[PDB]
Amino acid sequence: AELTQSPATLSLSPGERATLSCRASQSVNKYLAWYQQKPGQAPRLLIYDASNRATGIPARFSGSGSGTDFTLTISNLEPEDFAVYYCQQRSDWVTFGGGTKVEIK
């Protein structure tokens, strides 16, 4: 099962809303996680099972979608939110997308 992340780069300003898309090659139902990776650091789980926030994750991070169309929303962007975000599916073993670099301008 393959994951396509769009856009490759998403440049926004603080306070703006980030809409990240993850598309699955086959249906993965709700078995999708989203991670944040700040540079030189390891991924941090943000969302699991498409929409559930992980422990200590701000409300501004919201997950949505099912089957093949999934979305990570970072409403009210904060400068610290600049990272590459990855989606990972667990339905057909383990695969991650290519990342979306979120730049803060």
Partner: protein, 126 residues
């Protein structure tokens, strides 16, 4: 179950050689079945490499590394080990040990999410 995964330092290696990455797990309870290995090539997303399967208590590796990957764990020192052999320049990546999230239901060919990760270990192949 709040843990801390600490990895070994960055290695620079010559092609055709082998690298051994370690991963010290601190806190809670060590489980060799929960700590798994992944890698992240530059500009790429993470990629699962292997784990030690429960019941069988046997290491299991992704097709790509099968034949040249060796995963072990020492329950006494709560340390997970990884060893990648016949190093190719394409093996240039940051190697991660990560702990799994236990699913409410584990089914046919389903996998895991990863909550805690080690800092990563850059392995640079010449």
């Amino acid at each position: 179950e709040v843990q801390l995964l600490e990895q070994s330092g960055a290695e620079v290696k010559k092609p055709g050689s082998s690298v051994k990455v370690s991963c010290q797990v601190f806190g809670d309870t060590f489980s060799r079945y929960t700590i798994q290995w992944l890698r992240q090539a530059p500009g790429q997303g993470p990629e699962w490499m292997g784990n030690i399967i429960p019941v069988y208590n046997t290491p299991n590796y992704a097709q790509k590394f099968q034949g040249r990957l060796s995963i072990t764990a020492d329950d006494s020192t709560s340390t997970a080990y990884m060893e990648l052999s016949s190093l190719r320049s394409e093996d240039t990546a940051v190697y991660f040990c990560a702990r799994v999230v236990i699913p409410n239901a584990i089914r046919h060919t389903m996998g895991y999410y990863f909550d805690y990760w080690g800092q990563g270990t850059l392995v640079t192949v010449s």
